[PDB]
Amino acid sequence: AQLCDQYATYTGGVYTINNNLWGKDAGSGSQCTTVNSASSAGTSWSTKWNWSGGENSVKSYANSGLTFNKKLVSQISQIPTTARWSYDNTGIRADVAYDLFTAADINHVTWSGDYELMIWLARYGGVQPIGSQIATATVDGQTWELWYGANGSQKTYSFVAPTPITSFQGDVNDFFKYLTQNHGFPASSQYLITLQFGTAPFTGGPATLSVSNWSASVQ
């Protein structure tokens, strides 16, 4: 599939790829997402974009998302994941990130949360998460800048890699554990509802993110 419309989507196995140009009215340009595979084991895809204007507004979050059995964060044992990706053009203002949502209501809309957990594998052009940097966190032996921000309904923790990580393998539950244990995250009353990986562009391009593999599961 070739996904160019705002909410063009394709599912295969437990992976759903969404072009997700949720911010397209904030600027001028286009974006198309290509799915290479999407099976029970993993997905491969790419997205090519060019955006101008609205320089402090995100245009899109094209992504692959996992279908999983929703549960309380405190009941999760592991969220193993691998991500391998690259950009052809890094002269851009954008980031590459895991995006997860949690809500007290297990039927909450899946494009937002009571809480959000992001893990930024890269940022370009100095773009930053919502809020402020509140800590340096060491998670599974690796250091992340930890940001916390809120817009009055959604509270968002962003872990940011000091240098880009183009080949990631880890357990996302280590980050929830860290939040639960160190920042009072309410794991025992929050359902994990969404688990995605993709890129959030502000300005630049043409530029293409190639995701050679993304895999995840929730146990």
Ligand X SMILES: OC[C@H]1O[C@@H](O[C@H]2[C@H](O)[C@@H](O)[C@H](O[C@H]3[C@H](O)[C@@H](O)[C@H](O[C@H]4[C@H](O)[C@@H](O)[C@H](O)O[C@@H]4CO)O[C@@H]3CO)O[C@@H]2CO)[C@H](O)[C@@H](O)[C@@H]1O
Residue 140 DSSP SS3: coil
Distance of alpha carbon 69 from alpha carbon 64, whole angstroms:
17
Angle among Cα 104, 109, 110 to the nearest 5 degrees reads 95
The nearer residue to ligand X, 61 or 85, going by C-beta atoms, is: 61
Considering only the stretches 18-26, 37-45, 132-140, 163-171, report the one whose residues sit in contact with ligand X under the rule CB under 6 A: 18-26
User: Could you give the CA distance from residue 110 to residue 142 in angstroms, rounded to a whole number?
Assistant: 29
Stretch that binds ligand X, among 111-119, 162-170, 172-180, 208-216 (CB under 6 A): 111-119
Q: Is 20 in the site for ligand X (CB under 6 A)?
A: yes
Binding ligand X (rule: CB under 6 A), the pick from 31, 156, 173, 190 is 156
Q: What is the distance between the alpha carbons of residues 156 and 200, in angstroms, rounded to a whole number?
A: 15
When the beta carbons of 141 and 205 are compared against ligand X, the nearer one is 205
The beta strand positions in the chain, using DSSP E, are: 2-3, 9-12, 15-18, 28-38, 43-52, 62-66, 71-72, 80-87, 93-103, 115-124, 132-139, 142-150, 155-160, 167-171, 191-216
SS3 150: strand
* Shortest Å, Cβ 102 to ligand X: 13
Which residue from 14, 139, 192, 200 is in contact with ligand X, where contact means CB under 6 A? Answer: 200
Q: Give, as one character, the DSSP assignment of residue 24.
A: G
Which positions from 60 to 99 touch ligand X by CB under 6 A, shown as an x/- string? -x---------------------------------x---x
**What is the nearest approach in angstroms of ligand X to the Cβ of residue 63?**
7
Q: How far apart are CA 122 and CA 166, in angstroms?
A: 8
Taking the least distance from each CB to ligand X, the nearer of 40 and 163 is 163
Tell the smallest beta-carbon distance from residue 69 to ligand X (Å): 21
CB of 61 to ligand X, least distance (A): 4
Q: Which residues bind ligand X (CB under 6 A)?
A: 7, 18, 20, 22, 58, 61, 95, 99, 111-112, 116, 129-130, 156, 200
